[PDB]
């Protein structure tokens, strides 16, 4: 099977 | 290089209790060593851990589609990834090779240390006991502790402070999840 | 019972980033950012699982942009150097002429930047050496392993030499038979 990356989130500017 | 450094870290953590029956997911953001904002699946929203993270807590909690991705991560991320690697992580079992050899606390003196060297095992939970003539020796036991070799094996040295006498038989006993019964190695003076 | 961590970082001004998965404190894989490849910690793992390296590259880019934002929020407060503790050990009991491996364990340090040299009788050695990427700790410092396969002889001494911005002098940890 394939590992599935948890996405990063863009910080507030 | 005396230029100042600046570090960002993210850790997306999946905590598993009793297989996948109980799962906790943590989305953690760090500046240098400082966790500033975190999503805890126990809560289901981001929370500022320090004041540095307040902007992100507010901004990210306003994105209901983001919060729903994170609220589902225990299933789509934690449970999924646990399944992908189960055969070579959760079910990884590597037998402990056990070596017993004498040593010295002070060079030029005599052998006064029996070393039980337990090498190459996985996973880390292990119990090592010392016996003399079938009697457990609880005194004079010192150890390296559990050592991670960095290559999916562990080792530990468990040492017995004793002055060996002729006729005495010493036994290192190793219990480990890879074994079905205790493993014993004898040493005679 | 078990913990899996996808651990990432990005460091300025070095512009170095890293992306790895950890299971119970051992590295499952990391992504070589230069080659854009998944590198399995043990080669067997790659025969049972896969990972699309592009997702790591995407996250690192976000991490780079986020570091810029957080640096400003902190008023450009930089990291405090934490120098490493260093231990040298062998992975199995040592017997003359029996091949073995020297392990250099570099622990509890930050930032994740280090120069590590193996020395045999005071000279750098490189044939056969290998190393891990920076591994995460629960206190959000780092640790790292370097390895040197060797043949134990009474004629050789070894040192692991670790350089880090938190150290005044290089740290040398010695091993001999
Ligand atoms: C950065 O400086 C501003 C202005 O003095 C202040 O309001 C803010 O709290 C500071 N941030 C930190 C993390 O020290
Ligand atoms: C590593 O070595 C390079 C070249 O000698 C140097 O520029 C850098 O500052 C060193 N890094 C550390 C952490 O000592």
The CATH number of residue B19's host domain is 3.10.320.10
**Which ligand 1 atom is the nearest neighbour of the CA of B52?**
13
Distance, in Å, from the CA atom of B159 to the CA atom of B54, rounded to the nearest integer, reads 51
Specify the 3-state DSSP secondary structure of B66.
helix
Domains C1-78 and C79-177 share a fold: no
Distance, in Å, from the CA atom of B146 to the CA atom of B21, rounded to the nearest integer, reads 29
Same domain, B31 and B45: yes
Q: Ligand 1 centre from B81 Cα, in Å?
A: 40
CB atoms inside a 10 Å sphere around CB C168: 6
Short-list B169, B163, B180, B12, CA closest to C3: B12
Shortest alpha-carbon distance between residue A10 and chain C (Å): 6
Q: Ligand 2 centre from B127 Cα, in Å?
A: 42
Measured over the CA atoms of residue B145, residue B151, residue B153 and residue B155, the dihedral's sign is: negative
Same domain, B14 and B53: yes
Same domain, B100 and B24: no
Q: What angle do CA B4, B9, B15 make, to 5 degrees?
A: 155
CB contact under 8 A, C66 and A8: yes
Cα separation values, B7 from B1, C79, C83, Å: 16, 7, 16
Q: Is residue B115 a contact partner of residue B49, using CB atoms and an 8 Å limit?
A: no
Distance, in Å, from the CA atom of C88 to the CA atom of C145, rounded to the nearest integer, reads 10
Q: Is residue C106 a contact partner of residue C91, using CB atoms and an 8 Å limit?
A: no
Residue B23 DSSP one-character state? E
Q: Is residue B77 a contact partner of residue A6, using CB atoms and an 8 Å limit?
A: yes
Distance, in Å, from the CA atom of C176 to the CA atom of B92, rounded to the nearest integer, reads 33
Residue B13 DSSP one-character state? E
Resolution in A: 2.1
Please give the method by which this entry was determined: X-ray
What total number of domains does chain B contain?
2
Structural domain harbouring B157? 91-189
Ligand 1 pocket (Cβ < 6 Å) reads B 52; C 74-75
At which of B59, B90, B121 does a domain end?
B90
At which of B90, B105, B134 does a domain end?
B90
Same domain, B37 and B103: no
What is the domain class of C1-78 according to CATH?
Answer: alpha beta
Distance, in Å, from the CA atom of C156 to the CA atom of C177, rounded to the nearest integer, reads 8
Same domain, B63 and B140: no
Q: Is residue B92 a contact partner of residue B122, using CB atoms and an 8 Å limit?
A: yes
Q: Among the CATH numbers 3.40.50.2000, 3.30.870.10, 2.60.40.10, 1.10.10.10, which is that of C79-177?
A: 2.60.40.10
Write out chain A residues lying below 8 Å of B56, CB-based.
9, 11-12
Q: Where do the structural domains in chain C lie, given as residue ranges?
A: 1-78, 79-177
CATH code assigned at B167: 2.60.40.10
DSSP string, chain C: -EEEEEEEEEEETTTEEEEEEEETTEEEEEEETTTTEEEESSGGGGGT-B--THHHHHHHHHHHHHHHHHHHHTTSPPPPPBPPEEEEEESS---TTS-EEEEEEEEEEBSS--EEEEEETTEEE-TT-EE---EE-TTS-EEEEEEEEE---TT-EEEEEEE-TT-SS-EEEEEE-
Same domain, B127 and B76: no
The torsion of the CA quartet C45, B95, C5, C106, rounded to 10 degrees, works out to: -100
At which of B67, B90, B113 does a domain end?
B90
Same domain, B143 and B110: yes
Same domain, B130 and B64: no
The reply, when asked if residue B80 is annotated as ligand binding, is yes
Distance, in Å, from the CA atom of A12 to the CA atom of C2, rounded to the nearest integer, reads 33
Same domain, B105 and B143: yes
DSSP string, B101-146: EEE-SSTTS---EEEEEEEEEBSS--EEEEEETTEEE-SSEEE---
Q: Which helix (H) or strand (E) holds B83?
A: helix B80-85
Same domain, B100 and B188: yes
| Closest ligand relative to C111 C-alpha | 2
Window 1-13 of A: residues touching B by CB (8 A cutoff) are 1-4, 6-9, 11-12
Same domain, B45 and B118: no
Same domain, B85 and B163: no
């Amino acid at each position: 099977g394939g590992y599935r990356a948890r996405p990063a989130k863009a910080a507030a500017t | 290089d005396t230029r100042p450094r600046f570090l960002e870290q993210v850790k997306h953590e999946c905590h598993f209790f009793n297989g996948t029956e109980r799962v906790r997911f943590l989305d953690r953001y760090f500046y240098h060593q400082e966790e500033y904002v975190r999503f805890d699946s126990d809560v289901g929203e981001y929370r500022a851990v320090t004041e540095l993270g307040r902007p992100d807590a507010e901004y990210w909690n306003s994105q209901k589609d983001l919060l729903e991705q994170k609220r589902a991560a225990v299933d789509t991320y934690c449970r999924h990834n646990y399944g992908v690697g189960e055969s070579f992580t959760v079910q990884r079992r590597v037998y402990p090779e056990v070596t017993v050899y004498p040593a010295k606390t002070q060079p030029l003196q005599h052998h006064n240390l029996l070393v039980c060297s337990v090498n190459g095992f996985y996973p880390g939970s292990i119990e090592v006991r010392w016996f003399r003539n079938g009697q457990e020796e609880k005194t004079g036991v010192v150890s390296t502790g559990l050592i991670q070799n960095g290559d999916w094996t562990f080792q530990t040295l468990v040492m017995l402070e004793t002055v060996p006498r002729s006729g005495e038989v010493y036994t290192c006993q190793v219990e480990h999840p890879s074994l079905t019964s205790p493993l014993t190695v004898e040493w005679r003076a | 019972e078990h913990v899996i961590i996808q651990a990432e970082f990005y460091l300025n001004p070095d512009q170095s980033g890293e992306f790895m998965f950890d299971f119970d404190g051992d590295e499952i894989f990391h992504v070589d950012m230069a080659k854009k490849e998944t590198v399995w910690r043990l080669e067997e793992f790659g025969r049972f699982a896969s990972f699309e390296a592009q997702g790591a590259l995407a996250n690192i880019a976000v991490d780079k942009a986020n570091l810029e934002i957080m640096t400003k929020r902190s008023n450009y407060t930089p990291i405090t150097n934490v120098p490493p503790e260093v231990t040298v050990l062998t992975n199995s009991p040592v017997e003359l002429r029996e091949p073995n491996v020297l392990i250099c364990f570099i622990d509890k340090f930050t930032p994740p930047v280090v120069n590590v040299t193996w020395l045999r009788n005071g000279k750098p050695v490189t044939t056969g050496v290998s190393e891990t990427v920076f591994l995460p700790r629960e206190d959000h410092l780092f640790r790292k392993f370097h390895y040197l396969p060797f043949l134990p002889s009474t004629e050789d001494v070894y040192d692991c030499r670790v350089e880090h911005w938190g150290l005044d002098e290089p740290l040398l940890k010695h091993w001999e038979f």
